[PDB]
Design a protein around this motif. Structure first.
Motif: not given
Length: 94
Positions: A2, A23, A26
């Motif tokens: 993350s 991720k 985005s």
């Protein structure tokens, strides 16, 4: 894995795989216009290096990450992402 912000990701070393690609590409992390601006600016910052705590290093890092994400979008190949070249000597002399 993350990443709280796109700019933080650009300053870190990490394995860029499909999960991290989706991720990081985005619009809520980084709008498309700004992603494309970093990508367009890559050539200007391609070989930039120095201490990490400057505005130009952060910009260079964002352009490097945008280019790495573009490469993944074409190839689908996992690549180790590393931020622009730096050194301990660079840090101490800044």
């Amino acid at each position: 894995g993350s990443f709280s912000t796109f700019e933080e990701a650009a300053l870190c070393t990490f394995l860029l795989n499909k999960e991290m690609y989706l991720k990081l590409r985005s619009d809520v992390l980084l709008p498309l216009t700004q992603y494309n601006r970093y990508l367009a600016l890559y050539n200007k910052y391609k070989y930039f290096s120095g201490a990490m705590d400057t505005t130009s290093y952060r910009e260079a890092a964002c352009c490097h990450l945008a280019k790495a994400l573009n490469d993944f979008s074409n190839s689908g190949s996992d690549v180790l992402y590393q931020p622009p070249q730096t050194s301990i000597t660079s840090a101490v002399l800044q």
